[PDB]
């Protein structure tokens, strides 16, 4: 534990999933294998400034901020949003993605949907236990259950007229208008809900480490850098700053 221990080794121990594209993935289109991503190149970059080697350790989300208490990690990238509750248990470096979620609907009617109380009666569609699954409900939308489907197949049920919405993080769902830009879909223009922001987890005590992460962040988001490694893994668009939206907050 320490920054001064972690400066000795001259590497720095991170947990991550390797299961959150395009965040923290493998790049297996390449052949590489190789554990990448947005998240993943900013703390790999930002260890870089300081001088210091990576050494990614891949485990479920569960046990993972645990393994930080435990000192069995120096730290946790996982797309974790920075909330109060966490933030009086760990040590948060500055944020280095700003989103909200949104919906998908037709791109022709935007499947009857105006608002999120137009959500009432609608066949929603995606993961089944998120936190995007649970506004839906809230919103008396109909969950369709999926027995093992893609991407592609989810938002061709929606431009089908099978489904009607998914919702989902903003920036994933850009990606998804992207990758078919010639389905009948697209990203609602009015509902934005549930801001959020993610960063670095670390042990709380780990105050040296945080302050020389932060330095190295900082040094990369007036650089471009940050800028850099997001347009590269979320197609032109940059997450590291915080869009000035009217995003409603939900329950």
Do not use: C
Not at 12 to 28: K, N, Q, R, W
């Amino acid at each position: 534990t320490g920054w001064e221990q972690i400066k000795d080794k001259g590497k720095i121990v991170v947990a991550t999933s390797g299961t959150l594209y395009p965040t923290s993935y493998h790049d297996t289109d390449s052949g590489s294998d190789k554990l990448t991503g947005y998240e993943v190149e900013v703390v790999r970059e930002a260890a870089k400034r300081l001088g210091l080697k990576v050494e990614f350790k891949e485990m479920g989300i569960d046990g993972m901020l645990t393994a930080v208490n435990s000192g069995q990690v120096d730290a946790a990238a996982n797309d974790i949003d920075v909330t109060k509750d966490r933030e009086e248990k760990f040590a948060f470096s500055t944020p280095y993605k700003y989103s909200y979620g949104t919906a998908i609907v037709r791109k022709d009617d935007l499947s009857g949907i105006k608002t999120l109380k137009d959500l009432k009666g609608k066949k929603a569609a995606g993961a089944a236990t998120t936190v995007y699954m649970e506004v839906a409900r809230k919103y008396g939308a109909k969950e369709v259950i999926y027995d093992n489907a893609t991407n592609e197949q989810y938002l061709k049920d929606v431009a089908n007229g099978r489904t009607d919405v998914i919702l989902n993080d903003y920036y994933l769902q850009t990606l998804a208008l992207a990758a078919f830009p010639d389905l009948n879909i697209t990203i609602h223009p009015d509902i934005k809900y549930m801001p959020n922001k993610q960063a670095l987890v670390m042990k709380k005590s780990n105050a040296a480490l945080q302050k020389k992460m932060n330095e190295a962040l900082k040094e990369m988001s007036k650089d471009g850098s940050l800028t850099k490694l997001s347009k590269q893994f979320f197609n032109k668009a940059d997450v590291s700053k915080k869009i000035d939206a009217d995003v409603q907050d939900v329950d």
